[PDB]
Design a protein around this ligand. Structure first.
Ligand SMILES: CC[C@@H](Oc1ccc(Cl)c(Cl)c1)C(=O)NC
Lengths: 237, 300
């Protein structure tokens, strides 16, 4: 059934599962034409497929060429997402294939179910959680590889860096969703928080800065303050 | 004109014959139904006065034999039987006819309702959906489940409707996932029509039989089957023109005949709104859309 606050620790058990987020698959800029009409121009997108237990991120880059000559792109984007997720699963050894795929938007359920008919024993689930994965393109290194791509491409990341050496996956996922929630609510402020101290750098093989345990506590506190404030600023409280 | 005589009527019962029905009192001198039109299937059905649970009945075609109903006090129901002694059957039917203890099938001359509801329904196909090969007639009741329902428990007493499932490998060609799911023409025209049903007449016959079991017995799996067969056509962009015109006529008469008070349970709001207003065939069902909008605007 649907994943929610009540069945949350299931994310961190030993049943392989993937979150799939499609919010950045089909991306456009909206602009005026010379005649004064409006047009869209597609930019590169990405499927965000995440193992929440291990941090393994399968970032399938969606090049704008895939939309050429196609109609109803927002509908197509859901099916393309499902096609690529199904190809990912088929590319994995049996013992690495997920037991469950959790889609972050309910409109992905039928496309993915239809593409996964060959895998009757993989459960396709929605979620009641309002996960901030749309903000993945606020992570500079992920935005960079998406925007530089000249062809379809899959890039593999660990979105937790080396955190699992020191914290549990529950805690790592909590930190990830806090960071992303903050980046979604106020990207500029959130990014200032993360970099304000120039001595704390991002390793070449990492996405986030190399904070100590204590510095992560300060960072996390700053992200919660940001989120609460924007909540006031936005509802006036 | 043919006759289904009755041994007796030991228990108070509402008897249906096609779209007609009448009340028989306990031990009333009722001995059957005469003047039944040859050329159509028919259904004789029963609801006991003491148990509005279990509507049940028998699909039959008088061309296939001489049939009669007798109440079984052990099994507690009116049973259809075949008398193979034709002499004895005409002899028994003439006796009861002379004593005027039979109701007349009360068809109005202008009235094509039953023909229009059973146009494609064939007894031989009914007997493949309802498997009981020793009899020439077929028993159905409110509780019988369908094969598809059994998959999601007694297979001998099931309704073997053709299984339709929009999210199945049969329905979806590898590499045409989005195409085949949004435009079911392949599934309709190649898998079902050419592959399984062979022709649209057999498809329409099963569709009409499923509707009638839903209406006369409240059979829920039958209702599911009827809507699925409608939805498959409406969700196909490419449908022969003759099929769309005939579907419009079939549905029109079904909606016309449905008891007004049962529209809440027998009509699936989603399917009908999709079929009439969103589907490829949204503009192809003029008669059906008009009677639906004038008779059940609430559902829409
Ligand atoms: C068991 C007695 C019952 O048997 C029947 C046999 C055949 C028919 Cl078609 C009918 Cl209607 C009845 C009867 O009353 N015979 C006059």
């Amino acid at each position: 059934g649907a994943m929610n606050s009540s069945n949350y620790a299931e994310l961190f058990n030993n049943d392989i599962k993937l979150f799939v987020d499609d919010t950045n698959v089909y991306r456009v800029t909206v602009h005026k034409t010379f005649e004064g009409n409006v047009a869209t121009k597609a930019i590169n997108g990405c499927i965000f497929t995440l193992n929440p237990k291990t941090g393994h991120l399968f970032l399938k880059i969606i090049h704008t060429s895939v939309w050429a000559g196609q109609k109803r792109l927002s509908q197509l984007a859901k099916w393309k997402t499902a096609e690529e997720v199904s190809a990912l699963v088929r590319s994995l050894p049996k013992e690495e294939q997920p037991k469950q795929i959790i889609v972050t938007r309910k409109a992905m359920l039928d496309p993915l179910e239809v593409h996964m008919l060959d895998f009757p024993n993989i459960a396709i689930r929605p979620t009641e959680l309002r996960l901030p994965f749309s903000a993945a393109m606020s992570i500079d290194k992920l935005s960079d590889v998406v925007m530089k791509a000249t062809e379809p491409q899959m890039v593999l990341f660990n979105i937790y860096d080396d955190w699992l050496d020191r914290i549990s996956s529950y805690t790592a996922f909590s930190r990830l969703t806090l960071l992303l929630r903050a980046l979604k609510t106020n990207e500029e402020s959130a990014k200032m928080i993360l970099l304000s101290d120039p001595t704390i750098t991002i390793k070449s093989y990492h996405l986030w800065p190399s904070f100590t345990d204590e510095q992560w506590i300060t960072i996390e506190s700053q992200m919660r303050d940001l989120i609460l404030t924007e909540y006031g600023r936005k509802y006036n409280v | 004109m043919n006759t289904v005589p009755f041994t007796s009527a030991p228990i108070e019962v509402t008897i249906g014959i096609d779209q007609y029905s009448f009340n028989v009192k306990e031990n009333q001198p009722f001995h059957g139904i005469k003047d039944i039109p040859i050329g159509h299937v028919h259904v004789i059905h029963f609801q006991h006065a003491d148990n509005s649970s279990m509507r049940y009945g028998y699909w039959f075609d008088c061309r296939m034999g001489n049939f009669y109903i007798q109440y079984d006090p052990k099994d507690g129901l009116y049973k259809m039987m075949e008398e193979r002694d034709g002499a004895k059957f005409e002899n028994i039917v003439h006796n009861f006819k002379e004593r005027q203890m039979m109701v007349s099938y009360p068809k109005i001359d202008e009235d094509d309702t039953w023909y229009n509801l059973t146009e494609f329904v064939q007894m031989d196909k009914i007997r493949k959906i309802v498997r009981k090969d020793e009899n020439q007639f077929s028993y159905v009741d409110s509780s019988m489940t369908t094969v598809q329902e059994n998959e999601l428990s007694d297979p001998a007493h099931s309704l073997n409707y053709t299984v339709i499932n929009f999210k199945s490998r049969e329905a979806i060609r590898p590499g045409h996932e989005m195409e085949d799911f949004l435009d079911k023409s392949y599934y309709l025209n190649t898998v079902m029509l050419q592959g399984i049903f062979k022709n649209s007449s057999n498809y329409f016959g099963e569709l009409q039989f499923a509707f009638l079991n839903a209406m006369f017995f409240g059979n829920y799996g039958s209702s599911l089957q009827w809507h699925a067969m409608i939805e498959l056509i409406c969700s196909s962009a490419t449908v022969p023109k003759h099929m769309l015109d005939k579907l419009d006529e079939i549905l029109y008469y079904q909606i016309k005949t449905l008891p007004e008070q049962y529209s809440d349970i027998l009509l699936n709001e989603r399917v009908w709104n999709i079929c009439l207003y969103s589907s490829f065939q949204k503009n192809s069902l003029h008669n059906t859309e008009k009677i639906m909008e004038n008779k059940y605007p609430e559902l829409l």
